[PDB]
Design an enzyme around this catalytic site. Structure first.
Site, mmCIF file in Angstrom:
data_model
loop_
_atom_site.group_PDB
_atom_site.id
_atom_site.type_symbol
_atom_site.label_atom_id
_atom_site.label_comp_id
_atom_site.label_asym_id
_atom_site.label_seq_id
_atom_site.Cartn_x
_atom_site.Cartn_y
_atom_site.Cartn_z
ATOM 1 N N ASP A 47 -61.383 0.344 24.391
ATOM 2 C CA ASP A 47 -62.835 0.280 24.523
ATOM 3 C C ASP A 47 -63.323 -0.204 23.159
ATOM 4 O OD1 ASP A 47 -65.501 2.603 25.585
ATOM 5 O OD2 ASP A 47 -65.438 0.418 25.346
ATOM 6 N N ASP A 62 -60.641 4.489 34.612
ATOM 7 C CA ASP A 62 -60.094 5.230 33.489
ATOM 8 C C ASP A 62 -60.882 6.527 33.460
ATOM 9 O OD1 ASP A 62 -62.592 3.931 31.783
ATOM 10 O OD2 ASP A 62 -61.813 5.754 30.858
ATOM 11 N N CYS A 115 -47.081 15.898 47.045
ATOM 12 C CA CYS A 115 -46.864 15.185 45.792
ATOM 13 C C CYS A 115 -45.383 14.925 45.515
ATOM 14 C CB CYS A 115 -47.464 15.980 44.635
ATOM 15 S SG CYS A 115 -47.210 15.204 43.053
ATOM 16 N N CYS A 161 -44.231 13.889 42.402
ATOM 17 C CA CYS A 161 -43.923 13.999 40.977
ATOM 18 C C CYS A 161 -42.826 15.016 40.622
ATOM 19 C CB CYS A 161 -45.199 14.298 40.184
ATOM 20 S SG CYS A 161 -45.570 16.054 39.934
ATOM 21 N N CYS A 199 -43.691 18.845 40.818
ATOM 22 C CA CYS A 199 -43.730 19.450 42.139
ATOM 23 C C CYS A 199 -42.352 19.600 42.767
ATOM 24 C CB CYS A 199 -44.650 18.642 43.045
ATOM 25 S SG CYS A 199 -46.375 18.833 42.583
ATOM 26 N N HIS A 238 -48.359 16.165 36.457
ATOM 27 C CA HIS A 238 -48.700 16.231 37.865
ATOM 28 C C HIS A 238 -50.012 15.508 38.151
ATOM 29 C CE1 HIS A 238 -49.864 17.573 41.818
ATOM 30 N NE2 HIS A 238 -51.027 17.903 41.282
#
Ligand SMILES: CN(C)CCSCc1cc(N)cc2c(=O)[nH]c(N)nc12
Ligand SMILES: CN(C)CCSCc1cc(N)cc2c(=O)[nH]c(N)nc12
Ligand SMILES: [Zn+2]
Ligand SMILES: [Zn+2]
Lengths: 369, 369
Positions: free
Chosen positions: B92, B267, B305, B307, B310, B336
């Site tokens: 930014d 974002d 999930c 990931c 998990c 996660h």
């Protein structure tokens, strides 16, 4: 594998290198056990702890009996399942820390939680039970803290009480079928810095019989020279065919010296604790990464270290992270430090196996200092 | 790959899914960019960020120009090398945050560091330079913050100034050979909630010409309904063949709605920030893992999930970790959450490619709420 089997493959002077076979895995000795305070090795996933080379970790009993609770962890399936570490776990008895972080009697200790002030009683019987509920692989006998300095009589009384507590720990452990058949029990030698007391403690412990023997009551502020002095005559008193565990000792130079005196196992929070203070271990001695001279240093924490951190990030980056108080800073510093320690144990094990440990110790000290 | 190439593979209503090709890699859109405040995606190693599915991260300019410093990072080899992320990085312009975390004039903004109180001047020219020194792949034009609520005249003046600053950003960017040839420049639309101002901003931006267009000035407290209302007429004003970036918007339901209105990039710190507060995202809505009802819940954070968190740890464990204030707690919660977000973007991309996005949005909301 067997419940517990310790065999020595090589020796040099008082030093030994070998393995401890247990149901959940093999432990290479001399061994360094990362410390897991709140059911977590500070800032590291179990897989990362294992990747550094650790074969076993130390489960922090004191905090666990309070925060989550022993009964709760058992209900949830035990510590191994809870935190995601399927290898051996050694648990301290909790009593020592209580007398640190109280009403003490021949039956145990009464104290107030350092979290919510709740009242709790901890006895040899309850300590063994808690370690069982946690699913500990190596259980420590419940002993009493001996203040330092300590007079002969005060040291004798406390040591005598610890020996009485050791017998109670042993029986409580043996009365629990599942625990006696899958876990091991370590007795703890006490007696402050007095040789006659250390000998009495050792004989009492050997008389009871344990799977391992720890040298307790050291690293309480007596300085390396005195500690080494005590180890010189203390360790030989312990049975030679069983592991020798020095509790709460972790500075690299302490470890090397302790191994030269017969110690096979170590644990220390220093590696992880120094993983936030900014202290990183190197073969050229420790460095505080927060120091300004590292702001643009592109070299890894240590020029030889093989850990993932030293392969990917620079001192300059870790310097920035620690000074910015970023979590990743603690993560990287801790992984490196623990990897450094395991690399130290590997070099000690190899040097003993090759009969050149004494020379390694000399070379290590010359450069480290 | 080319410096910058955005191609749309599929559409449904105002929604689009495609890819942005850049020298350091490909970006799948709609895309979610994890935020890297102090040159680090909070509590995660770059490899873990990538493993969750992220193709690009957002580099926090404001903090970096202060703490480590732009010049220092360049000397050290740039942000990619510094933090260990070799893929695209969007930065930014810093101006907006300055007017948050001051003397403002037509030439830029003067402010005092929120760290040591030091004085600093930030202009369109200096912002572009800093992003260049950081080695940013996608550079944001330097714009001015428009307070909310904002009157038409106040919104017009600020927007008009931002457009003047946009032209200056563009020229400064083009005057730097290396940057103009390897990086991309995004202009930012302003105009508060006023349609005529949004149209003027869009025409000015299109007149200048940018590689991408962001809808700025939203998510400043106007509520989802108003934001969506503004997006309805604002996004269509932007060139259709260039990426549309909604800054500072990350709640799942916000993202879905914004994509239905033509947004391609997002974002938000919410994913990571909520990775300490105890908030974990699930398809059944967010949950605060600190809640007592999770103390003995053996199920993973989310039943579907994919990931690593998990797959290996339970809510009960993460619950304990967060309440104990352990670093691992933040690590697991953040991994996660970011994985959840990337999975959300994947489902959005797939549903659009298959022409069933509108239905996905409906199914998502019904269950999420
Ligand atoms: C916080 N840790 C560094 C210490 C946890 S308590 C571990 C510990 C450390 C030391 N130095 C001596 C002894 C001892 O004599 N007995 C027991 N049971 N534990 C001990
Ligand atoms: C801390 N972060 C959540 C915010 C960092 S600043 C990102 C950011 C967020 C929002 N909501 C609007 C704008 C905008 O209009 N212009 C610029 N340059 N940046 C913006
Ligand atoms: Zn290293
Ligand atoms: Zn998950």
């Amino acid at each position: 594998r067997p419940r517990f089997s310790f065999s020595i493959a090589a020796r040099e002077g008082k030093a030994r290198t070998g393995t401890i076979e247990m149901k959940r895995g093999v432990i290479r000795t001399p061994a360094f056990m990362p410390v897991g305070t709140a059911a977590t090795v500070k800032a590291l996933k179990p897989e990362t702890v294992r990747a550094t080379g650790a074969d076993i970790i130390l489960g922090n009993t004191y905090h666990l009996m309070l925060r989550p609770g022993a009964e709760r962890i058992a209900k949830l399936g035990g510590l191994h399942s809870f935190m995601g570490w399927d290898r051996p776990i050694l648990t301290d008895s909790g009593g020592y820390q209580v007398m640190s972080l109280t009403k003490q009697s021949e039956e145990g200790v009464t104290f107030k939680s350092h979290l919510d002030g709740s009242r709790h009683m901890l006895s040899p019987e309850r300590s063994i039970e808690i370690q069982h509920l946690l699913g500990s692989d190596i259980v420590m006998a419940f002993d009493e803290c001996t203040p330092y300095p300590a007079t002969p009589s005060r040291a004798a009384s406390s040591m005598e009480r610890s020996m009485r507590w050791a017998k109670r720990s042993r029986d409580a452990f043996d009365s629990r079928k599942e625990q006696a058949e899958n876990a091991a029990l370590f007795g703890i030698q006490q007696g402050s810095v007095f040789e006659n007391l250390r000998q009495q403690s050792a004989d009492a412990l050997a008389e009871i019989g344990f799977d391992g023997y720890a040298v307790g009551g050291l690293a309480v502020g007596e300085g390396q020279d005195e500690m080494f002095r005590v180890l010189d005559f203390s360790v030989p008193m312990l049975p030679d065919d069983k592991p020798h565990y020095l509790m709460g000792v972790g500075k690299p130079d302490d470890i090397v010296g302790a191994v030269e005196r017969g110690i096979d196992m170590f644990d220390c929070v220093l590696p992880t604790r120094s993983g936030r203070n900014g202290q990183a271990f190197t073969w050229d001695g420790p460095i505080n990464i927060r120091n300004a001279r590292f702001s643009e240093d592109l070299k890894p924490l240590d020029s030889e270290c093989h850990c993932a951190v030293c392969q990917k990030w620079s001192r300059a980056y870790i310097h920035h992270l620690i000074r910015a108080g970023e979590i990743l800073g603690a993560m990287l510093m801790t992984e490196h430090n623990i990897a450094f320690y395991q690399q130290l144990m590997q070099k000690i094990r190899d040097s003993i196996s090759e009969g050149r440990f004494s020379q390694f110790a000399q070379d290590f000290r010359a450069r480290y200092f």
